[PDB]
């Protein structure tokens, strides 16, 4: 049989797909996640804050 990729296929998005949220997903916290401090963030982190005494 043909072992190569098929170039004659639909290259566009499928509108006939389920548009709703999936109830069959893992509802639990992920234990396999980066536990470290992520040395990539805005180090000048004064971007925008309330300048008044109260929120």
């Amino acid at each position: 049989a043909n072992p190569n990729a098929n170039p004659n296929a639909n290259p566009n998005a499928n509108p006939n797909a389920n548009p709703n949220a999936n109830p069959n997903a893992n509802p639990n916290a992920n234990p396999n996640a980066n536990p470290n401090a992520n040395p990539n963030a805005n180090p000048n982190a004064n971007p925008n804050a309330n300048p008044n005494a109260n929120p």
Partner: nanobody
């Protein structure tokens, strides 16, 4: 230009394993299936294995099935051949070929350089 470069050969005593490789360049690796072909010294060519473009389907020759394993890594453009329980009759030059399909049968348009595997004691 299509470039297939192979490595991983050498000398190995019978009964144990060896792994070959075939690094590719000059084409989209994830779009094509690949073949392994070997040639015993002074003999003709012999087909060994094929792998699909996505790695779903593998086919092996009758004399190497159960022992050889073919796999690919699409993120490194590399084709592997894991050769286990090597015997004396497995001494040959191994080539990697790019799969092509014409009408009702397949062929290989581009071939590698070949690497020599010798099994001896």
């Amino acid at each position: 230009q299509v470039q297939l470069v192979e490595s991983g050969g050498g000398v190995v005593p019978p009964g144990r394993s060896l792994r070959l490789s075939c690094a590719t360049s000059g084409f989209t690796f994830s779009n094509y299936g690949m073949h392994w072909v070997r040639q015993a010294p002074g003999k003709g060519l012999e087909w060994v294995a094929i792998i699909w473009y996505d790695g779903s389907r593998n086919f092996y020759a009758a004399s190497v099935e159960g022992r050889f394993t073919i796999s690919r890594d699409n993120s490194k453009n590399t084709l592997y051949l894991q050769m286990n329980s090597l015997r004396v009759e497995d001494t040959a030059v191994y080539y990697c070929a790019r799969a092509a399909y014409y009408d009702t049968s397949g062929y290989g348009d581009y071939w590698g350089q070949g690497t020599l595997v010798t099994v001896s004691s």
